[PDB]
Symmetry: C3
Subunit: 115 residues, 3 copies
């Protein structure tokens, strides 16, 4: 799975990595997908806006081959939002999360398709 | 909705904010979605290329829970492209826009999924 | 087509664009699409993580209106991974590629829908 965090909140690299690691743990726990396949990123975007302002805000896009369903999505939305509020100080009402279900045939690793 | 602008065109932060605000207004007008629900971003990507060169270019990805259809897409393609050319100086022929639909069950706000039930 | 490269490997702009040019060539060949239609990007993301570490890694998202299929995906997965290993020094096993199909109705160019 892939976890893209896009935020106008700035924290040092170790603390950014710490937050990603906790999100990775939640993804591992809820989806049951192996660490080997988990990607995460903290993309600092100074011009990011939500609700017509540049106030602190986070958007997460989570892409997964399966595991995208009401139960998992609700669990991860709760967990990920809490992690972000804790480590980045973002208001829960300034956190959006998108869940994307993708097909195995549309992914490649080390130059070959999963199939 | 989420509106991700990716461009190799450098403009001052205040001007980037102004352009994003105008795009937000167009999105609200066409899709009927309140600004309160709109995310937008100006992602300066200096090495972004189109048609084999690093010449001025904009790519926009617009994601919305519904409202993705021929009439709305056409209207927003026209409105957004005009805003970009005006504010950024990009040539319309170097503006790409992608439209993405999302189900409410696959989108969360304040730690909870959108939709009922 | 659009090819978004996201990587925690930093290289100078001239070298970044060279890698992109080679990727563009490969895309043009495999998908039978002229360079005129190809967008590419090199997005340096220093905090990007894969498999639980911040070690050198490349993620590629390739979006096309059609041309997303086993043969094309397989061929491009092979070609793009080789390019990235050659040009960026990344290990093939830390190259992850996502292929996306987009409808022509959901893409616009020059202010008008495709096309």
């Amino acid at each position: 799975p892939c976890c893209e965090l896009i935020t106008n909140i700035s924290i040092p690299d170790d603390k950014a990595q710490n937050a990603l690691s906790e999100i990775e743990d939640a993804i591992s726990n809820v989806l049951g997908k192996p660490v080997a396949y988990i990607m995460s990123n903290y993309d600092y975007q100074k011009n990011l806006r939500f609700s017509g302002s540049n106030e602190g805000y986070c958007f997460v896009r989570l892409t997964s081959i399966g595991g995208i369903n009401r139960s998992n999505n609700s669990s991860l939305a709760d967990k990920i939002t809490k992690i972000l509020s804790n480590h980045l100080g973002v208001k829960p009402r300034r956190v959006y999360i998108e869940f994307r279900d993708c097909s195995a045939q549309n992914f490649a690793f080390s130059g070959s398709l999963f199939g």
